[PDB]
Design a protein around this ligand. Structure first.
Ligand SMILES: *[C]C1=C([C])[C]=C2C(=[C]1)N([C][C]([O])[C]([O])[C]([O])[C]OP([O])(=O)OP([O])(=O)O[C][C]1O[C](N3[C]=NC4=C3N=[C]N=C4[N])[C]([O])[C]1[O])C1=NC(=O)[N]C(=O)C1=N2C#C[C][N][C]1[C][C]C2=C1[C]=[C][C]=[C]2
Ligand SMILES: *[C]C1=C([C])[C]=C2C(=[C]1)N([C][C]([O])[C]([O])[C]([O])[C]OP([O])(=O)OP([O])(=O)O[C][C]1O[C](N3[C]=NC4=C3N=[C]N=C4[N])[C]([O])[C]1[O])C1=NC(=O)[N]C(=O)C1=N2C#C[C][N][C]1[C][C]C2=C1[C]=[C][C]=[C]2
Lengths: 494, 499
């Protein structure tokens, strides 16, 4: 019933917010729609897999908030396997390599690839993390799709295809679905192209021992009966002295403030009194989430390692259901597995099949790419299609179609009277990730602490000390990477 | 409590559906979120204006369903004033004209304009009204914005600027916001470029005497206590024998079937048990409505008529808050008024101002365009910003961003167990309009009648006889309009003769 703050949503962001407020001495209640916490993180446990992350899983250097929160909760990380060679599968053929980037051998193609990645980061440097709509060319870039940008930038089909895969993999959406400004912001605020795409020294470096779901679970343990499961919020009334929050199961909660810790568009599931301001009213209809199926195929042994393959596959082409895989074997070396993502339109297309049909397609693909008949003998399979989730809307995160970020972006975390906004979408560093969830939840919590006069304004946004366990190596470039001309640059020189 | 069909939403579509089912002998309930019926139609009444449509207003030839329904309810239409000259205001200067389209004199610009409109309709012919995703080049066209298409097609800035205004006016959205496939479908399913843009012989020909809100109001009168106002639906449960529909004000309704007659994205405001299928779950997060403020400035007299201007202004340029106006004077010749739309990004930008500030900007614009100091002397003002409406989401209708229509379009009116889908967005002829609302409401109703075994399958979709009161003249082209080359066409012709 009555409390200081109601947090709507028990994902990592809502839980991080609730924990901070609880630790500060406030009475908090978390209202969670599902029969579980964790939201876009979910760790399944059974005998066949021990545990498996079916949602958010990967963490790495520069994600210091999620690492600090998890450590405090008693969790540990381990390193995703990248000892052996990676594979780039191009036009029906596998090409093993080392380092974060699949090599290019044709000279013109090399220049084009080099320029593409470089230009992505160049453009990102002009985009403020906390205000992408303030980029000098914000409107120009927001009014183009990533498809249009790639069409302009890539003078080779090779570069265009790999860039397309990159977009699909990053934001689980098609290049023609997303704003160029938004996508460039997204990459920049994860620390740039190298940082986001890398396993070693990047966002995919590590996983939590026992699963990422433990973060939300362990905070629920700390908060006790303050977390209310199967309480979907349906109504928020701010017309009176205290805010009134009503749930589907006919309960009423009364609070001084509310944190909305749900995906922006899922604010549509709540009826507001008074109505939301115009800009937020329309914003929450303009911000869909991506489409992905996360699939994990289990094997007797990590057989790929014997062939000097680490399990990472970058797989070109329409026919391939999965464009990207990582080794998902346990740190102990058992429960051997390959994790793959079915991305964007392919998640839509292949959802029509049965679980068994998808397994067969994945195994046959992996057999081809790994050049191993062993891939045809799975021992177990788990998958999760996030497109079906009423209380997520998709995964990994919210994307912005052309024109939306500039027109509506400033609304995202603007308070509405006594409602403050958390959720990974509102983060300024690793938005879209578990790291962003923690940043946004803790910032939203501190906005309320400031509103209550408990902390000064300059304490709302707080820096995070670097993890001692997961140190970040700086991202470097070579002289030639910096100064080699683009394809049109070479042509102008000629 | 218990009934045959619950209709969610008391706009024209829900009301049309409810009426058909009621007339067929079924027990229906309409659950309406607002304290009024009509939804995206709203007729304000006060002593200063008598009545004024602040939402949907215009009807015209080929919109036979809304005309038939309104006539049955005892309503009449009158013709929007188009007696005197129209104005095209370009680069700070007004150019009076007659006909649906502003004349273009420059031979190159003329070829470009002619080719643009022609190509829009050409492409439209490849798009099935009931299945736009089945167009031969559906994916190619859906993966481009209208901005990209205009950039490719228009070899002159003049054509590009007018085409841009056209898109903004049609779908209250920016060219870069919307799919080319979807926009081409939208225009084609309203009968093409000429039909959609025209006053005489087009969608803007007429208004209802007394306002369009009377359609929903008079159906409510017919249904009596079956319409429940201030009942926002929050929950639909289909796990049991009968469907359970719950409202915000703590009421439960039980039905054999449900019609969802709300804008597609507003389905998000309902919690579903079991969850929606994957495609619909995601579809309803991908389909925003446009942004518009409808503004009506009142004057002592329709002074523009004295200068041989009918009141229609097509106003290009970023500085103009309103890009399009029509005379909104009553058929009696009193309550003189100009209606203007503030479109797309400008609805967002100018919402920051006060009502008085917007009135001043509109009057100053009109004074310039009409070359008339009288425009600076308004006697009254009404406006409605539809962007602020929780239970509309915007106006006029739902638009599809690039990639969505091909991936999710087939889901739009696909039943979900015992839920059927009405609403103008699901229409196949004049979707986006009051006409489409009627088509979709009656089709959804008949889907349920068929499900109950009351009518055969071939009676689900029903043709409509042409109105005797509002006959449609066919859309015609000239020989030159059909065969004149595009700009690149002319250049290729020059290339070959030079070679
Ligand atoms: C799904 C997913 C997947 C599959 C994957 C992934 C992901 C995901 N990610 C993301 C994450 O997960 C996120 O971000 C997070 O989690 C978020 O959080 P938040 O913010 O908190 O949110 P959520 O969770 O959603 O929560 C919410 C809540 O709420 C609730 N609700 C709703 N509604 C309502 C409610 N309540 C009450 N009432 C109402 N009304 C719900 O239920 C919930 O609970 C991620 N992340 C990270 O970090 N990591 C990872 O890994 C992930 N993932 C992914 C990744 C990928 N990667 C890849 C590989 C290679 C590459 C890439 C990328 C890029 C480059 C390269
Ligand atoms: C807004 C608007 C404006 C401003 C204008 C216009 C319009 C609009 N339009 C459109 C119409 O209005 C529409 O379409 C209709 O109305 C629709 O109907 P429906 O489908 O039925 O829907 P609604 O109304 O929305 O209804 C719904 C209902 O439901 C309810 N809800 C929600 N949610 C819920 C509920 N309930 C319970 N629960 C829940 N949850 C609500 O409340 C409602 O009631 C139009 N149309 C026509 O026809 N006409 C006209 O006029 C119009 N408008 C416009 C126009 C323009 N024009 C222009 C000029 C020149 C040109 C143009 C265009 C193109 C070319 C040229």
């Amino acid at each position: 019933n009555k409390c200081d703050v109601v947090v709507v949503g028990g994902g990592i962001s809502g839980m991080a917010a609730a924990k901070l407020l609880h630790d500060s001495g406030l009475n908090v209640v978390v209202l969670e729609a599902r029969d579980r916490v964790g939201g876009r993180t979910y760790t399944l446990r059974n005998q066949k897999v021990k545990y498996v992350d079916l949602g958010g899983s990967y963490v790495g250097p520069t994600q210091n908030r999620i690492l600090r929160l998890a450590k405090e909760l008693g969790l540990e990380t381990y390193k995703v396997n990248e000892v052996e060679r990676l594979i780039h599968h191009v036009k029906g053929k596998s090409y093993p390599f080392r380092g974060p980037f699949p090599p290019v051998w044709n000279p013109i193609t090399y220049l084009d690839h080099n320029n593409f990645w470089r230009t992505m980061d160049d453009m990102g440097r002009e985009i403020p993390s906390d205000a992408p709509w303030k980029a000098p060319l914000a409107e120009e870039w927001d009014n183009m799709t990533m498809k249009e940008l790639l069409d302009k930038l890539c003078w080779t089909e090779s570069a265009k295809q790999l860039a397309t895969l990159f977009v699909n993999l990053c934001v689980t959406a098609e290049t023609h679905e997303v704003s160029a400004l938004w996508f460039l912001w997204y990459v920049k605020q994860c620390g740039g192209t190298t940082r986001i795409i890398s396993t070693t020294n990047g966002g995919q470096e590590r996983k939590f021992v026992g699963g990422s779901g433990q973060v939300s679970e362990r905070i629920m343990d700390l908060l006790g009966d303050r977390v209310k499961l199967e309480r979907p919020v349906i109504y928020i009334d701010q017309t009176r002295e205290n805010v009134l929050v009503e749930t589907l199961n006919h309960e009423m909660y009364e609070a001084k403030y509310v944190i909305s810790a749900i995906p922006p568009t899922l604010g549509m599931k709540i009826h507001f009194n008074p109505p939301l301001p115009m800009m937020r009213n329309q914003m929450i209809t303009r911000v869909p989430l991506g489409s992905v199926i996360k699939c994990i195929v289990y094997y007797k042994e990590p057989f790929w390692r014997k062939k000097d393959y680490c399990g990472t596959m970058i797989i070109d082409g329409e026919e391939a259901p999965v464009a990207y895989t990582l080794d998902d074997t346990k740190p102990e070396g058992n429960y051997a597995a390959i994790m793959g993502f079915i991305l964007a339109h392919k998640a839509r297309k292949l959802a029509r099949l049965t679980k068994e049909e998808r397994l067969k397609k994945l195994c046959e693909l992996y057999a081809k790419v790994l050049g191993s008949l062993e891939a045809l003998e799975p021992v177990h399979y788990e998958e999760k299609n996030w497109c079906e989730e009423q209380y997520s809307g998709g995964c990994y995160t919210t994307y912005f179609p052309p024109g939306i970020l500039t027109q509506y972006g400033r609304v995202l975390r603007q308070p509405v009277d006594r409602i403050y906004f958390a959720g990974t979408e509102t983060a300024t560093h690793w938005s879209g990730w578990m790291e962003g969830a923690v940043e946004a939840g803790e910032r939203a919590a501190r906005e309320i602490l400031h509103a209550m006069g408990k902390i000064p304004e300059d304490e709302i946004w707080q820096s995070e000390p670097e993890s001692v366990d997961v140190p970040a190596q700086p991202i470097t470039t070579t002289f030639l990477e910096r100064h080699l001309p683009s394809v049109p640059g070479l042509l102008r020189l000629i």
